[PDB]
Design a protein around this nucleic acid. Structure first.
Lengths: 51, 59, 72, 56, 102, 53, 9
RNA sequence: AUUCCCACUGUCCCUAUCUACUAUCUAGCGAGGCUGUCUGAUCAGGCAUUGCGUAAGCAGUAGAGUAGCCGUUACGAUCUGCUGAGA
């Protein structure tokens, strides 16, 4: 269970590139390596992990 | 080292609520074995569990 | 034994976070020259988050203690 | 605001004897201060034998 | 009418951390009869026999006041954290060391 | 005399600072000394500083 | 202008 | 409800500064003084969305008054000095 994009793009621990501050990051979970909710208006917001 | 039940039992036995009981930080292992109210009373007698006094504040 | 001028280091910090950030400041202090004693945490939070003394006298061994002096 | 009331103005210092109307004048003002310090020190020393005993 | 208060200072005195004469002097100098320091008009008499201090009072005097004065004297000599003023019988007291790990 | 007075002033200020440090903000539940236990080394050091046997 | 101060004595 | 008189005002001439909140990135997931109050009282501090220039201490025989006698215990605001000091 780890983000696909962050793992693909993967000293980093102790410090697909949209909106990344100037573009490098320090993805700890990637380096180390189905849910549903309604909302303000009734709907079916489905959030899925991307292993 | 999960003394939640021990604090609950000490508060019930001494009858002073969980805000007045004091469990010895240096006797975690000894308190961890007090699974019954008799052992809690024994700990209170030995001074491992203590009852705090009412705050000294003028009415 | 050191003297830390926390008035200089805490300038411009919001009054809501003076006491917590001060804990991080002394941690940096011992890192510059070289675990906080709970008595020193009491000394830091003596006047709450909003107020921290301008100067503090410390004893660093890194284990850091507050020392009792008439004035800093 | 009356200038003679505020101690940081020269009007107060002249109208109260603080300012000459200089160094010798200040020495004249500050005569006997050492005696007062000595007397208060003597009283403090004689007022707490126990604390001196702790000192020794 | 006279009431007797007994304080047993044997334990601190034998341990070399107490002077009963100074203690009795502090009481006789700070009884405060009728709200006045040193107004001992023969109503309050203090005797020091070496190990037991006896206070005989016919005026308003209580064991709580004696405990307060003793604790003040202990704090003045900064022995408050090691010696406590405790009672054995009614109006019979002593000074006892706090619990110490050997 | 005037040196002993300075020592007295410094020690009084130190004691006041220590008492303030021990004192806290809004009063809390009291932990009586008669129910807690103190070690012997602290007692030995304090009594030696006092000047007793 | 200031004169003699406490420190300067 | 409307119109004139006086006073006030960042409405404006004409904008400027500060505080809070917000916005951004990262790890994971993811569509000095004063009022009130409290530390038993001083001292020193906390709180009340800045709440709204002579230190602590000691002394004077000067000091409103509280408390002993028909020259005299004691407490004592305020004032004066250490002190353009203290921070």
């Amino acid at each position: 269970r780890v983000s696909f994009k962050n793992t693909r793009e993967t000293q980093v621990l102790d410090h697909f590139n949209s909106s990344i501050g100037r573009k490098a990051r320090w993805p700890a979970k990637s380096v180390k390596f189905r849910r549903r909710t309604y909302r303000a208006h009734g709907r079916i917001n489905k959030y899925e992990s991307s292993p | 080292a999960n003394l939640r039940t021990q604090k609950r039992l000490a508060a019930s036995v001494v009858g002073v609520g969980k805000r007045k009981v004091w469990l010895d930080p240096n006797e975690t292992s000894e308190i961890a074995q007090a699974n019954s109210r008799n052992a809690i009373r024994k700990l209170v007698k030995n001074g491992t569990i203590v009852k705090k006094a009412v705050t000294v504040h003028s009415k | 034994e050191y003297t830390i001028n926390l008035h200089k280091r805490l300038h411009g910090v919001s009054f809501k976070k003076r006491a917590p950030r001060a804990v991080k400041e002394i941690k940096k202090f011992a890192k510059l020259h070289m675990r906080l004693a709970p008595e020193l945490n009491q000394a830091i939070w003596k006047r709450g988050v909003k107020g921290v003394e301008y100067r503090l006298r410390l004893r660093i061994s890194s284990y850091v203690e507050p020392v009792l002096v008439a004035s800093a | 605001r009356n200038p003679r009331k505020l101690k940081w103005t020269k009007a107060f210092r002249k109208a109260a004897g603080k300012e000459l109307a200089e160094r010798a004048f200040y020495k004249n003002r500050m005569r006997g201060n050492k005696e007062k310090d000595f007397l208060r020190d003597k009283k403090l020393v004689e007022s707490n034998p126990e604390l001196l005993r702790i000192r020794e | 009418i006279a009431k007797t208060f007994t304080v047993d200072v044997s334990s601190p005195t034998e341990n070399g951390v107490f002077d009963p004469a100074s203690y009795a002097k502090y009481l006789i100098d700070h009884i405060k009869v009728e709200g006045a320091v040193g107004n001992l008009g023969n109503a309050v008499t203090v005797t020091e026999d070496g190990t037991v201090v006896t206070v005989v009072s016919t005026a308003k005097f209580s064991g709580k006041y004696l405990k307060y004065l003793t604790k003040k004297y202990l704090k003045k000599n900064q022995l408050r954290d090691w010696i406590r003023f405790v009672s054995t019988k009614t109006n019979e007291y002593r000074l006892a060391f706090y619990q110490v790990t050997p | 005399i005037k040196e002993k007075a300075a020592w007295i002033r410094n020690r009084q200020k130190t004691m006041i600072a220590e008492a303030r440090n021990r004192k806290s903000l809004k009063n809390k539940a009291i932990m009586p000394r008669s129910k807690l236990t103190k070690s012997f080394g602290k007692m030995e050091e304090h009594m030696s500083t006092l000047g007793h046997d | 202008f200031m004169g003699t101060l406490k420190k300067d004595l």
